[PDB]
Write a protein that binds this ligand. Structure first.
Ligand SMILES: Cc1cc2nc3c(=O)[nH]c(=O)nc-3n(C[C@H](O)[C@H](O)[C@H](O)COP(=O)(O)OP(=O)(O)OC[C@H]3O[C@@H](n4cnc5c(N)ncnc54)[C@H](O)[C@@H]3O)c2cc1C
Length: 456
DNA sequence: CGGCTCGCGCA
DNA sequence: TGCGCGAAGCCGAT
């Protein structure tokens, strides 16, 4: 498709056709940012060769109703910042509301677009939208992987069983795809109020707000400032203050020593490639650098590999054969406790460590990476069936996590409950051969009282 | 055949 | 606290 610093393997054609005379439309979805965006850079390079301008279109679907206000505000406030950023470079943005399959097909014809570009996402509803758009448009339709360092269809062509199998593949293509980003060139040609979409959506999600007894909201929105500018500040402080002690205190929820980048990385407000570019150049603890790189490279992109090659990524059928056989044999085992969704949601279990994990999820919208395993694994231990446990874990994960509705969530829940990307362990009642995690093992690794007293 | 992102005993 | 074994099924290099 042309360009000096542009790798042609990051782009693949979804539909071939005669390139129109109008501008190039970039259908923004996952990577909501202006800097370090391959999809936005590829749309500008195409527009430069065709002597056309580049426009951005964002379709606001009804998916914000299944979520909550904490995710809707975090996204809308970032889109307000992105509008001024793109407007500074003479790039206009259009914000549509409704079905992307019907709205973007109408936008391409109404605006007489010449080439449509979109970003990559392995989720089901994105592939369903792209198929409906292809059937209604007559212009070329391209797809760019701007989220992963190595494109998903390039790192592997099949489902990866474990990380130590996917690890040598990723690090082998790293010297080719780890490159610096060129600056976005402003538009030479210039061819819906976000404040109203914010107030309308908030009033519709007000009854579903998570409250306390005194009708006070549980969400604390001052923990993570949304936007592209704030996301870069979280990156800088992590590499300057937290990266040294990461490899030693990454599993201690009493110490705020993780990167805290998952809410920004989910909405695409910060590029993981930019994070790797800056972490690699830093001089820090070599063990901590290798530990953080293994999280943002393999485990982040193997989760995209999981959902892209397993369409039932949120179902029991995606589990390995050994895990399904073990879970099916222990279906009739008597459970120590049985809790419904409402009891798991409000945090009314006998385990104070589990309840404290749920309060962190409800109050801050981001539960610590270590306690998320204890949170999900105990849901499987105290549920009717593995299907209900998978249902409850996915529901609370997508409802209250700021990084929810993300491939890392479904892969992480499939790891905790279904042993995906994991191996078998000692045979137990109810759980079977799935990895076990107890309250006593957490007491030997960190001060469990400080974590419980912090969140009641 | 080697080695994979827990619990547990022992310094 | 950090280290080493145990319990377990399977991929992938040959
Ligand atoms: C049951 C369960 C549910 C999860 N739900 C989500 C979710 O909804 N959204 C989400 O983005 N992540 C999810 N994760 C993955 C992981 O918990 C988060 O990425 C992490 O805890 C967020 O904090 P952090 O980015 O500061 O951690 P860091 O240690 O700083 O992580 C660095 C980055 O590496 C990646 N990463 C780290 N751990 C994982 C992992 N286990 N799997 C995949 N990528 C990882 C993420 O991009 C993360 O931003 C879940 C994990 C589990 C076990």
């Amino acid at each position: 498709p042309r360009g000096s610093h542009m790798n042609p393997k990051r782009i693949r054609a979804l539909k071939s056709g005669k390139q129109g005379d109008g501008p190039v439309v970039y259908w923004m979805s996952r990577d909501q940012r202006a800097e370090d965006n391959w999809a936005l850079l590829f749309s500008r390079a195409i527009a430069k060769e065709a002597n056309v301008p580049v426009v951005v279109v964002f379709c606001l679907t009804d998916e914000f109703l299944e979520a909550g206000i904490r995710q809707y505000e975090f996204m809308l406030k970032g889109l307000q910042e992105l509008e001024v950023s793109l407007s500074r470079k003479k790039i206009p943005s259009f914000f549509l509301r409704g079905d992307p399959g019907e709205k973007i097909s109408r936008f391409v014809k109404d605006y007489n677009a010449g080439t449509l570009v979109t970003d990559f996402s392995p989720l089901r509803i994105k592939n369903q939208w792209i198929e409906k758009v292809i059937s209604g448009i007559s212009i070329p339709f391209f797809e760019v992987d701007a989220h992963n360092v190595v494109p998903c269809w390039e790192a592997s062509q099949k489902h990866e069983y474990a990380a130590h199998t996917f690890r040598p593949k990723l690090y082998a293509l790293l010297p080719e795809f780890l490159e610096e980003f060129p600056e976005l060139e402003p538009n030479s040609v210039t061819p819906e109020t976000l404040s109203d979409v914010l107030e309308t959506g908030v009033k519709a999600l007000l009854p579903e707000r998570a409250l306390l007894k005194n009708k006070d909201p549980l969400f604390e929105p001052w923990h993570f400032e949304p936007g592209e500018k704030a996301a870069k500040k979280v990156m800088e402080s992590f590499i300057a203050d937290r990266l040294d002690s990461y490899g030693a205190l990454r599993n201690d929820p009493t110490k705020n020593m993780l990167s805290n980048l998952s809410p920004y990385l989910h909405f695409g407000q910060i590029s993981s490639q930019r994070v790797v570019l800056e972490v690699e150049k830093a001089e820090s603890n070599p063990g901590s650098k290798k530990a953080f790189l293994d999280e943002i490279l393999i485990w982040k992109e193997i989760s995209d590999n999981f959902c892209y090659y397993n369409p039932g990524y949120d179902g029991f059928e995606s589990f390995p054969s050994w895990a399904k056989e073990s879970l099916n044999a222990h279906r009739n085992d008597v459970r120590s406790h049985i809790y419904t969704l409402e009891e798991f949601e409000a945090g009314k279990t006998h385990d104070p460590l589990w309840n404290a994990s749920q309060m962190e999820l409800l109050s801050t919208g981001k539960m610590h990476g270590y306690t998320r395993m204890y949170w999900a694994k105990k849901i499987l231990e105290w549920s009717e069936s593995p299907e209900k446990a998978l249902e409850i874990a996915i529901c609370l994960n997508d409802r209250y996590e700021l990084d929810g509705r993300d491939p890392n969530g479904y892969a992480g829940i499939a790891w905790s409950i279904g042993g995906v990307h994991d191996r078998a362990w000692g045979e137990r009642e109810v759980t079977g051969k799935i990895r076990y995690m107890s309250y006593e093992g957490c007491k030997r690794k960190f001060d469990v009282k400080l974590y419980i007293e912090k969140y009641s």
